[PDB]
């Protein structure tokens, strides 16, 4: 549910 670092 967490935001990835692109």
């Amino acid at each position, epitope marked *: *549910q*967490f*935001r*990835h*670092d*692109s």
Partner: antibody, heavy 122, light 113 residues
Framework: EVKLVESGGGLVQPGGSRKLSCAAS????????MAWVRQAPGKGPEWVAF????????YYADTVTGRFTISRENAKNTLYLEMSSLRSEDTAMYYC???????????????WGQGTSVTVSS | DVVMTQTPLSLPVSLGDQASISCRSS???????????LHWYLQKPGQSPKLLIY???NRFSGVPDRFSGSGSGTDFTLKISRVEAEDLGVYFC?????????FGGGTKLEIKR
């Protein structure tokens, strides 16, 4: 193949501390968010903390926030959990776990280590 | 938090038979991106959980054909079509649609006699 190996468990007094490490191999470590998951005897797993792949996002379960600090160092392929003010209810197997992603969301913990045991007792 | 409710707590089965385990979430597991982030894990004695099925019905790498998952909204099922001795252990469902990710209480797969 993906490998995760945690260490730093042990027996500590209530109010003591721990710094767990998790060594990662077989994937580009800096491409993946990582988590800590703990499990007491007889219980299901319980998510503890999460850190995004470049460490812009960190989240904590309600049961640990304030006391634990998650961190990573991408150049050492290592994830960390500093734990303080430990209570007997923190006694558990502690697992390191990789989060997979296909786009912008870390959506599933797919590889888990064998765990490092932490006992908190007087 | 999202509460994951597994039934049965304990599941006796004959080898070669079919086992069915159900999971119920206390909220919809449809994420705003449209996926349903519901997963199943298998834990054997003295080992960590291993992922079996992710996003309702995708078999993880190396998971044999006899594991099948389905369901929608809040009601989910994992099928093991022909239980083998290596499948005995504790199965957990898990959701990753909402923070925090949560786990069911487990279902122990056990032998009938």
């Amino acid at each position: 193949e993906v490998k995760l190996v945690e260490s730093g468990g042990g027996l500590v007094q209530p109010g003591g501390s721990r710094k767990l490490s998790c060594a990662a191999s077989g994937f580009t470590f800096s491409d993946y968010g990582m988590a800590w998951v703990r499990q007491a005897p007889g219980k299901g797993p319980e998510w503890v903390a999460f850190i995004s792949n470049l460490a812009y996002s960190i989240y904590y379960a309600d049961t640990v926030t304030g006391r634990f600090t998650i961190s990573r160092e991408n150049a050492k392929n290592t994830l960390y959990l500093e734990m303080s003010s430990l209570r007997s209810e923190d006694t558990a197997m502690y697992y390191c776990a990789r989060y997979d992603y296909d786009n912008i969301l870390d959506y599933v913990m797919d590889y888990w280590g064998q765990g490092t045991s932490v006992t908190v007792s007087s | 938090d999202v509460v994951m409710t597994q039934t049965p707590l304990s599941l006796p089965v004959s080898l070669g038979d079919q086992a069915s385990i159900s999971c119920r979430s206390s909220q919809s597991l449809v994420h705003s991106d449209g996926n349903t982030y519901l997963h199943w894990y298998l834990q054997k004695p003295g080992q960590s959980p291993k992922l079996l099925i992710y996003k309702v019905s995708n078999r993880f790498s190396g998971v044999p054909d006899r594991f099948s998952g389905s369901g929608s909204g809040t009601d989910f099922t994992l099928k093991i079509s022909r239980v083998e001795a290596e499948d005995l252990g504790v199965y957990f469902c898990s959701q990753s649609t909402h923070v925090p990710p949560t786990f069911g209480g487990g279902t122990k797969l056990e032998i009938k006699r």
